[PDB]
Design a protein around this ligand. Sequence first.
Ligand SMILES: C[C@@H](NS(=O)(=O)CCCOCn1ccc(=O)[nH]c1=O)c1cccc(OC2CCCC2)c1
Ligand SMILES: C[C@@H](NS(=O)(=O)CCCOCn1ccc(=O)[nH]c1=O)c1cccc(OC2CCCC2)c1
Ligand SMILES: C[C@@H](NS(=O)(=O)CCCOCn1ccc(=O)[nH]c1=O)c1cccc(OC2CCCC2)c1
Ligand SMILES: [Zn+2]
Ligand SMILES: [Zn+2]
Ligand SMILES: [Zn+2]
Lengths: 126, 126, 126
Amino acid sequence: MQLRFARLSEHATAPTRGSARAAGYDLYSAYDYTIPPMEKAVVKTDIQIALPSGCYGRVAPRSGLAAKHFIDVGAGVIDEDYRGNVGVVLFNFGKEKFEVKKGDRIAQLICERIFYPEIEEVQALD
Amino acid sequence: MQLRFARLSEHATAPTRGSARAAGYDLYSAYDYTIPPMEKAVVKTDIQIALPSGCYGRVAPRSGLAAKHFIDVGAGVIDEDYRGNVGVVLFNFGKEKFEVKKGDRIAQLICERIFYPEIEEVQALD
Amino acid sequence: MQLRFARLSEHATAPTRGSARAAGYDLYSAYDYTIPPMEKAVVKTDIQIALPSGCYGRVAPRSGLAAKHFIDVGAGVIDEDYRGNVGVVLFNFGKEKFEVKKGDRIAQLICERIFYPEIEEVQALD
Ligand SMILES: C[C@@H](NS(=O)(=O)CCCOCn1ccc(=O)[nH]c1=O)c1cccc(OC2CCCC2)c1
Ligand SMILES: C[C@@H](NS(=O)(=O)CCCOCn1ccc(=O)[nH]c1=O)c1cccc(OC2CCCC2)c1
Ligand SMILES: C[C@@H](NS(=O)(=O)CCCOCn1ccc(=O)[nH]c1=O)c1cccc(OC2CCCC2)c1
Ligand SMILES: [Zn+2]
Ligand SMILES: [Zn+2]
Ligand SMILES: [Zn+2]
């Protein structure tokens, strides 16, 4: 039960989790972005991750950004085997622009347990 | 495998799950709210919950409210150890205002199994 | 560990998963739809599914559609015991209409592990 990660640049921040039983690790922006009202942005973390076996990585919303600034997270399904730069798709549904600065926490990364079933076609179920 | 909860006021409704194999328990509004088009509201349940070990509580959308009224749920990650009042962040993307009355079902609470990995930094993955 | 499915019409496409460790099976539209800017549509797959025991089926967003076209997935909680036609609720938050053609991939289906706890009311937690 290790989540490993590597920094892809000097702008990356190591993910953090304050509480031992918090659902997610904090993801941090590696760059500044300005997100206009009713617009989206793909926000780079400049980290790559190796998820534990038996899960995928869900990029999930921060609670305060959602309730206070009408920020949501799009996309969000990081496959267990993905080794690229982790991106966060932010949706700004508010009426004001939303500013992201390098080092800001912008999402959380949850290790969601899943099955990897084989698929079988039948003519009709039970 | 118990989900425990306590009512924080007399306005709270005990969560329900009709089917034994439904993914979620129904969450009910403790108050009336009017949510304008393209607006958000934090809706109180006036319950506190104690989630089973090995999960977090995902506040997830009701299917009919989403398809019929363009209601979505923001935020939604309830940490395993959270003991406060459970809030539901509703996003109204429709063109008409959305009315919540006390006692209305407004979301579902899913006990999502997750890992709680330790984090380790390396220079580069494999 | 089988995911079974049946086609409800000749327009359905068998779900696919390219990578062995991809989080989701691709869901395909059985029909053409035009989704106006800032509108929603319930998109039929014309498949029925039988999920493995111990999960629900999460209809989750495709990453490219989210980042490139501002498409999101609403609703999305398919109960373990659901045997109806699988619908995908697409939200088009972009400024242009979004075209779905029969056979297009429109979402992914994730077998999310969950608990099915019994619920217990107490006066106050710990
Ligand atoms: C344009 C589009 N390309 S994409 O090929 O559709 C997905 C590429 C990234 O896959 C991993 N992933 C999946 C979901 C997620 O939320 N975050 C994330 O990092 C995309 C979508 C989402 C995130 C992206 O992040 C970019 C930042 C640097 C590399 C990718 C890109
Ligand atoms: C303003 C902001 N404060 S916040 O500190 O960011 C989060 C406080 C609540 O944390 C638990 N939680 C987390 C996610 C969720 O969806 N629901 C929920 O109850 C917030 C965000 C979401 C729900 C909230 O509910 C309030 C209702 C009464 C107490 C908190 C508050
Ligand atoms: C109108 C509304 N009816 S509903 O009764 O609220 C839900 C009916 C479908 O339940 C399974 N389900 C649940 C969530 C999901 O995302 N997809 C899905 O197939 C609804 C909501 C979502 C999907 C729907 O799909 C329709 C396509 C053909 C049958 C249902 C319908
Ligand atoms: Zn630089
Ligand atoms: Zn009162
Ligand atoms: Zn036909």
